[PDB]
Amino acid sequence: EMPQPKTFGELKNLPLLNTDKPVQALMKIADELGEIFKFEAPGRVTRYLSSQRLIKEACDESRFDKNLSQALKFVRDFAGDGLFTSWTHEKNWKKAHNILLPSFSQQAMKGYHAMMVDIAVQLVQKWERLNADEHIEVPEDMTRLTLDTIGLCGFNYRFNSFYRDQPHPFITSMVRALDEAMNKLQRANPDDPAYDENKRQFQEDIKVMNDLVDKIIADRKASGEQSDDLLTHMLNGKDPETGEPLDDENIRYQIITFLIAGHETTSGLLSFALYFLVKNPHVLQKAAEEAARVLVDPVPSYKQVKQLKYVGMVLNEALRLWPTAPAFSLYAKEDTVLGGEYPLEKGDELMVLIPQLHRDKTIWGDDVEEFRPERFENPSAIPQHAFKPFGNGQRACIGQQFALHEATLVLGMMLKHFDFEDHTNYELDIKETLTLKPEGFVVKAKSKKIPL
Amino acid sequence: EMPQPKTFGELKNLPLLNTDKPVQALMKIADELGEIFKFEAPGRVTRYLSSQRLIKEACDESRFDKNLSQALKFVRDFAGDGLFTSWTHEKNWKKAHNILLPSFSQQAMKGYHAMMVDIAVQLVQKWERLNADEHIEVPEDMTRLTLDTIGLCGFNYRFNSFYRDQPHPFITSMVRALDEAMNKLQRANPDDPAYDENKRQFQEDIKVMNDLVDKIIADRKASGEQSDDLLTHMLNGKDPETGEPLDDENIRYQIITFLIAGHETTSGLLSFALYFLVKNPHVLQKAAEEAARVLVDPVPSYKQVKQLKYVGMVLNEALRLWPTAPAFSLYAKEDTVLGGEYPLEKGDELMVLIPQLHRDKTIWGDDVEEFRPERFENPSAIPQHAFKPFGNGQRACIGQQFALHEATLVLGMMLKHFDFEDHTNYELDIKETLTLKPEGFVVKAKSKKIPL
Ligand SMILES: O=C(O)[C@H](Cc1c[nH]c2ccccc12)NC(=O)C(F)(F)C(F)(F)C(F)(F)C(F)(F)C(F)(F)C(F)(F)C(F)(F)C(F)(F)C(F)(F)F
Ligand SMILES: O=C(O)[C@H](Cc1c[nH]c2ccccc12)NC(=O)C(F)(F)C(F)(F)C(F)(F)C(F)(F)C(F)(F)C(F)(F)C(F)(F)C(F)(F)C(F)(F)F
Numbered sequence: 009e010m011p012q013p014k015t016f017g018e019l020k021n022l023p024l025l026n027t028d029k030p031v032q033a034l035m036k037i038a039d040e041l042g043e044i045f046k047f048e049a050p051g052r053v054t055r056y057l058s059s060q061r062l063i064k065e066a067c068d069e070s071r072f073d074k075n076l077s078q079a080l081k082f083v084r085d086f087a088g089d090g091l092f093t094s095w096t097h098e099k100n101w102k103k104a105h106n107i108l109l110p111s112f113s114q115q116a117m118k119g120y121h122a123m124m125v126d127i128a129v130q131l132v133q134k135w136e137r138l139n140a141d142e143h144i145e146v147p148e149d150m151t152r153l154t155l156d157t158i159g160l161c162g163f164n165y166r167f168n169s170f171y172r173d174q175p176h177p178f179i180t181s182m183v184r185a186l187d188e189a190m191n192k193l194q195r196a197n198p199d200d201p202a203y204d205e206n207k208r209q210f211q212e213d214i215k216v217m218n219d220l221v222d223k224i225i226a227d228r229k230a231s232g233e234q235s236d237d238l239l240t241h242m243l244n245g246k247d248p249e250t251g252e253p254l255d256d257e258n259i260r261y262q263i264i265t266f267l268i269a270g271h272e273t274t275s276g277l278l279s280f281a282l283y284f285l286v287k288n289p290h291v292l293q294k295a296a297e298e299a300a301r302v303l304v305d306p307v308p309s310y311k312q313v314k315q316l317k318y319v320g321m322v323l324n325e326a327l328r329l330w331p332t333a334p335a336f337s338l339y340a341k342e343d344t345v346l347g348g349e350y351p352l353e354k355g356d357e358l359m360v361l362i363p364q365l366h367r368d369k370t371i372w373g374d375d376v377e378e379f380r381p382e383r384f385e386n387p388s389a390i391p392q393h394a395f396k397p398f399g400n401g402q403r404a405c406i407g408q409q410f411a412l413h414e415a416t417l418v419l420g421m422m423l424k425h426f427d428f429e430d431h432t433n434y435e436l437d438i439k440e441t442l443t444l445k446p447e448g449f450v451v452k453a454k455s456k457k458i459p460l
Numbered sequence: 461e462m463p464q465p466k467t468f469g470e471l472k473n474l475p476l477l478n479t480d481k482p483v484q485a486l487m488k489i490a491d492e493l494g495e496i497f498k499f500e501a502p503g504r505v506t507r508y509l510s511s512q513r514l515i516k517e518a519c520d521e522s523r524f525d526k527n528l529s530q531a532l533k534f535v536r537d538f539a540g541d542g543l544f545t546s547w548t549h550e551k552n553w554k555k556a557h558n559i560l561l562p563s564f565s566q567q568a569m570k571g572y573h574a575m576m577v578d579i580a581v582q583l584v585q586k587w588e589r590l591n592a593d594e595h596i597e598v599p600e601d602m603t604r605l606t607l608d609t610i611g612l613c614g615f616n617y618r619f620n621s622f623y624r625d626q627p628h629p630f631i632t633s634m635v636r637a638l639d640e641a642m643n644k645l646q647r648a649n650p651d652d653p654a655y656d657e658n659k660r661q662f663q664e665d666i667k668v669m670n671d672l673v674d675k676i677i678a679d680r681k682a683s684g685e686q687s688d689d690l691l692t693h694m695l696n697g698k699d700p701e702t703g704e705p706l707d708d709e710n711i712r713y714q715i716i717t718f719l720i721a722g723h724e725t726t727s728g729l730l731s732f733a734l735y736f737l738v739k740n741p742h743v744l745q746k747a748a749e750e751a752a753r754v755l756v757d758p759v760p761s762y763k764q765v766k767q768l769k770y771v772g773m774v775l776n777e778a779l780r781l782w783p784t785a786p787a788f789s790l791y792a793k794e795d796t797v798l799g800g801e802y803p804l805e806k807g808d809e810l811m812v813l814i815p816q817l818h819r820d821k822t823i824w825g826d827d828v829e830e831f832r833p834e835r836f837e838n839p840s841a842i843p844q845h846a847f848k849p850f851g852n853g854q855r856a857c858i859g860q861q862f863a864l865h866e867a868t869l870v871l872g873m874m875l876k877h878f879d880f881e882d883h884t885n886y887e888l889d890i891k892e893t894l895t896l897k898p899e900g901f902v903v904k905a906k907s908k909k910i911p912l
């Protein structure tokens with residue numbers, strides 16, 4: 009007798025996801041029904057998990073492996089067998105995993121630091137150059153930053169997002185590709201002639217992304233020039249197990265994948281972090297005091313970024329409340345029983361609803377809606393599988409250290425260089441595009457007039 | 461019988477200006493008809509002068525004064541009794557001239573230099589940051605630069621044009637305002653209610669310009685801060701002659717007037733200069749050698765800019781061939797005979813066709829179409845009134861030193877930092893908007909990797 013939300017005859021629970029904010033809907037359902045609920049659609053079923061008690065079993069890699077949700081299957085049409093949209097048992101997953109992990113270590117970030125600073129300084133300069141009555145469109149500027157950072161650090165390519173209003177022909181295609189994949193989740197009969205125009209458009213965007221990226225691949229191969237970026241590492245890199253390199257088609261899929269995941273997740277993080285800071289002035293002040301104490305040079309060093317302890321706590325608390333990639337899907341590797349109560353058969357699916365996990369009162373206390381970075385004073389105190397904004401196990405975010413170093417550097421610089429004003433008393437409105445962002449979030453930034 | 465071009469019945473010569481390129485059309489007429497021709501419209505007559513021998517007489521301030529051509533009378537609808545669109549005998553001309561002259565002096569350029577460098581560096585960084593496959597849209601980027609420079613230097617306001625594709629709402633309105641002013645010149649029967657829309661837009665644009673500028677003026681008054689800029693000088697300054705300051709309305713007209721000149725004339729000069737440089741590689745070699753030899757520091761000094769003699773010569777030769785404000789108008793103060801042959805009545809109008817003056821074979825030699833900066837190696841060798849890209853006498857360009865300093869600095873830096881390629885073998889196509897620019901002029905720039 010597993011709880012299940014309201015049904016719509018033969019459509020079962022499907023129309024519940026016919027909303028612009030499905031994750032927030034699922035969270036509300038979770039509040040009503042508790043740690044587990046069944047979700048059915050025609051010809052399919054999953055179970056949404058919200059408690060640490062159940063999710064710690066789900067995160068047992070001997071019992072469950074990553075499933076490609078429906079959203080991911082559609083993303084796969086353009087991200088292919090890149091790391092994010094591949095099955096664990098695909099040869100290209102384990103090859104790419106083995107090859108790329110070294111280039112994504114905490115220690116590899118030393119090599120990317122200079123290129124991260126390049127983009128971060130562009131952001132700071134932009135804000136320094138605004139006139140008095142002007143304001144900042146936060147998610148928009150964080151996206152310019154994060155896209156450009158992954159473009160530069162990973163492929164030595166400048167999207168030059170701070171020189172534009174109209175973003176790159178690649179990104180528009182990529183955004184529109186992501187849009188189309190999102191929509192198909194609420195679409196009876198995909199072969200309907202009504203959607204011929206949508207299929208047409210989907211195809212055009214893939215060609216944009218594939219042509220640009222392949223071209224860069226080939227230019228670099230011909231060139232033979234040595235950067236230390238992700239692309240170089242991939243061109244020369246051999247998988248220790250097979251002894252094979254990634255082929256050029258897979259390298260493309262990896263590039264598209266890095267560009268997608270998670271420029272948008274990382275910009276979300278920065279946007280939510282600044283949101284929580286301006287809504288919690290004592291926390292902002294503590295974070296600003298750290299930045300001023302630590303960032304003593306015009307150019308932040310790698311070591312200095314590692315010393316921004318409180319800024320790191322701020323980012324983790326923002327990830328707790330609004331994890332920007334808010335769910336991931338699993339399947340049972342064999343018949344097993346979840347929580348001593350719910351029998352599952354091989355192949356049965358789960359969804360881990362991360363925002364709800366992160367609101368588990370048995371783990372976090374009663375005050376789960378409050379923004380308190382101090383929860384992360386000692387991150388080791390957090391029980392296993394209680395905090396999972398970067399997913400689980402061998403299928404966890406390969407970009408976690410990149411994202412966190414980038415976000416810490418930038419937020420550090422922001423807090424060093426400006427005072428912030430929530431001049432509209434912004435009301436949180438979370439836009440969902442698979443990922444989460446605070447739509448319409450704006451601030452004013454008054455320079456502290458500290459030279460770069 | 462004075463030469464006169466072909467006619468269109470009762471419309472006389474008017475429809476000859478019903479073209480996108482009226483100045484270039486008038487130049488062809490001048491080549492056919494010689495040093496002087498009459499041009500009639502219904503209720504209007506003027507005489508176009510092309511030779512140094514007649515133009516030198518026209519430049520006698522005891523015999524002729526500046527006239528507001530029909531184009532200027534329309535621009536006056538938004539530029540008012542600012543310096544450019546006022547009559548010499550209006551009290552506000554001499555008043556503003558006396559007040560502003562010392563702010564536009566060669567010595568005053570020392571004070572503006574640092575903010576000119578600020579925008580110049582933004583241009584260079586933009587080009588340094590282009591990817592290998594990309595090219596530069598020349599007049600577009602020069603206009604970003606020149607507009608921003610005058611904004612910053614003159615009123616401490618950042619248009620941030622390098623952060624945009626869509627220009628500032630002020631610039632949008634101003635360009636559209638200018639365009640409308642030109643369109644009134646060629647349209648027959650301006651009372652026709654089909655132009656109700658054009659009128660509506662015009663007034664909206666005038667409003668946008670005035671409200672922005674009035675706001676900045678009011679804010680600087682309200683704050684009372686002091687900058688190294690034209691606005692400061694205008695709020696504090698008194699005309700030594702009358703002892704009167706400019707009132708806030710005239711101050712707004714001056715600001716609008718200065719913005720129009722930045723936006724239009726100086727960007728055109730830089731664009732034509734770069735055009736001639738890429739069409740004349742030996743000239744480019746000499747300019748680039750000088751820049752490398754003179755600009756020995758990452759941040760150019762005022763003193764170094766003054767040392768760029770050859771770059772200066774390149775700019776003057778570009779001004780000889782394509783003076784970007786290509787015509788000015790005069791009226792006879794009294795009955796007088798021009799050149800011993802052409803009797804004029806008081807009030808009779810003259811037009812000086814600057815590009816034709818600059819192609820006067822009796823002054824320059826037969827090779828007048830060739831680009832030869834060495835024509836300007838010695839200013840003293842140029843006969844009186846043979847070279848007039850900045851107009852004449854007390855009504856000459858007040859901004860000449862500003863424009864030449866900016867252009868020399870910026871061209872110097874461009875040649876220091878980049879090699880240039882005419883990758884399309886661009887065919888000169890000159891767009892006319894009451895100034896001249898080379899439309900669609902594009903190049904590629906290969907960085908010399910010299911740090912800023
Ligand atoms: O796609 C699914 O299978 C189910 C919803 C669903 C659709 N049809 C169903 C039928 C039965 C049961 C559930 C469903 N998806 C969700 O619950 C979801 F939360 F919206 C989601 F799709 F998983 C998700 F969170 F948006 C997501 F797609 F996983 C994701 F996290 F956003 C993501 F796409 F994976 C991502 F990680 F954020 C991302 F890839 F980076 C992306 F957002 F795409 F950029
Ligand atoms: O307006 C006139 O009286 C005559 C054309 C004319 C002659 N007879 C006419 C009879 C009826 C109608 C029009 C005419 N004017 C011009 O030919 C002219 F406007 F001076 C011009 F040649 F087009 C000109 F060069 F573009 C110009 F407008 F003078 C000018 F030099 F560009 C200029 F407008 F003054 C300028 F300096 F560039 C400027 F004003 F700064 C501007 F470009 F507008 F920003």
Ligand code: HEM
Binds near residue numbers: 093331410
């Ligand atoms: C705040 C920022 C980010 C968040 C919250 C985030 C979150 C996640 C999550 C939850 C997953 C697991 C998805 C699943 O199980 O289906 C994941 C996977 C992944 N992320 Fe991120 N991510 C972020 C930033 C980045 C960045 C910056 C990159 C790359 C530059 C990146 C690359 C990836 C890749 C490649 C995977 C797939 C890994 C694999 O299965 O082998 N992520 N991320």
Ligand code: HEM
Binds near residue numbers: 785850855856857
């Ligand atoms: C290459 C750049 C420029 C060229 C070729 C140019 C050309 C001219 C010309 C030909 C005139 C005389 C117009 C007439 O007789 O009707 C003039 C006047 C004027 N210019 Fe410029 N100009 C340039 C740059 C500037 C700049 C940068 C400014 C201001 C920042 C400026 C401000 C003015 C003003 C105010 C007048 C009117 C002066 C008066 O009558 O008192 N100009 N300019």
